[PDB]
Design an enzyme around this catalytic site. Structure first.
Site: not given
Ligand SMILES: C[C@H]1CC[C@H](NC(=O)[C@H]2CCCO2)CC1
Length: 330
Positions: A35, A199
């Site tokens: 994770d 992004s």
């Protein structure tokens, strides 16, 4: 040194991925959920409340000659999906894919929430976010990666998750045969303890690319792709009959649909998520309403590039002095 381990979907939907991890002496192999959105290595154990164990493999520290109680240390964690666990702490030897760390904090669960109990395939979590998020008190502990880092050939790990197939976690090296083209690196902020990056935009299907900054985290422990409501609405508008269902808890679509791809930007590069990756199947057995793999982050407080996005790429988690993230197509 290096390590290399195969990671395997837990079910036919890729709801999560499990990776075998050796703990203790002699080794006890547990299948952990790696994770990158948390920083605790915790396991089901001989200390876990009996009624809260249902098929998991447990760590028994009393059977490990290298286990040592970390005196006075406790831990307690709550995840974004509402699940939680807590307990006490041992140090022991932990190996992943041939890479060994001695003196790793292994957090033994005394209590786990129902979602953990109900998932027989996940024996615990191995956190790979920054150690500043580790919950051990009163002395915070380091992640497996942080402990290993100085010994690695290069201070990196990579995630290469499969679509409906096994993939690979590598530590200490970049497998140049595992991706196509070049790796595009992008800046990371560690201010919130995550692999947080921005992004450069998105496209839906064959549509034009929208240049827009989307700050979010690269999180192998989250199944879906969570993005701003504007982006998510633009995606689902291209699927006939798709709608947001408050009763189901997100966007659903007719199982008869063909889903468009979704592209996200990494600098000037582009990663394409095929439409099929966005199908999470019937909302309930036999239903013709299917759950979407792109959902709104509104109310979460952060955008999450979870497995739906990451599995479309070869992803480098660069833990150099100034961390960065790399993405390649594959
Ligand atoms: C203290 C730490 C404990 C782990 C938390 N991680 C998360 O909830 C995951 C799920 C979605 C976002 O990342 C972050 C805070």
């Amino acid at each position: 040194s290096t390590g290399s381990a195969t990671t395997t979907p837990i079910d036919s939907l890729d709801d999560a991925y499990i990776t075998p991890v050796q703990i203790g002496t002699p080794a006890q192999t547990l299948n952990l959920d790696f994770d990158t959105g948390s920083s605790d290595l915790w396991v089901f154990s001989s200390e876990t409340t009996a009624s809260e164990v249902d098929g998991q493999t447990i760590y028994t520290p009393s059977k490990s000659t290298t286990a040592k109680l970390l005196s006075g240390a406790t831990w307690s964690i709550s995840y974004g999906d509402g699940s939680s666990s807590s307990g006490d702490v041992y140090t022991d030897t932990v190996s992943v894919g041939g890479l060994t760390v001695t003196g790793q904090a292994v957090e033994s669960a005394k209590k786990v929430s129902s979602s953990f109990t109900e998932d027989s395939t996940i024996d615990g979590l191995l956190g790979l976010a920054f150690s500043t998020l580790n919950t051990v008190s009163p002395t915070q502990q380091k992640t497996f990666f942080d402990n290993a880092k100085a010994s690695l050939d290069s201070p990196v790990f990579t995630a290469d998750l499969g679509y409906h197939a096994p993939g690979t976690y590598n530590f200490g090296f970049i497998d140049t045969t595992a991706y196509t083209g070049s790796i595009t690196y992008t800046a990371v902020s560690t201010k919130q303890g995550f692999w947080e990056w921005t992004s450069t935009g998105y496209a839906v299907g064959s549509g034009t690319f929208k240049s827009t900054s989307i700050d979010g985290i690269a999180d192998t422990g989250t199944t879906l792709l969570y993005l701003p409501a504007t982006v998510v609405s633009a995606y689902w508008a291209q699927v006939s009959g798709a709608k947001s269902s408050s009763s189901v808890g997100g966007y659903v679509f007719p199982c008869s649909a063909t889903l468009p791809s979704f592209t996200f930007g990494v600098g000037s590069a582009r990663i394409v998520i095929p439409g099929d990756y966005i199908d999470f199947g019937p909302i309930s057995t036999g239903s013709s309403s299917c759950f979407g793999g792109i959902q709104s982050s509104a109310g979460i407080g952060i955008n999450i590039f979870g497995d739906v996005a990451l599995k479309a790429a070869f992803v480098v988690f660069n833990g150099a002095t100034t961390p960065t993230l790399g993405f390649a197509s594959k």
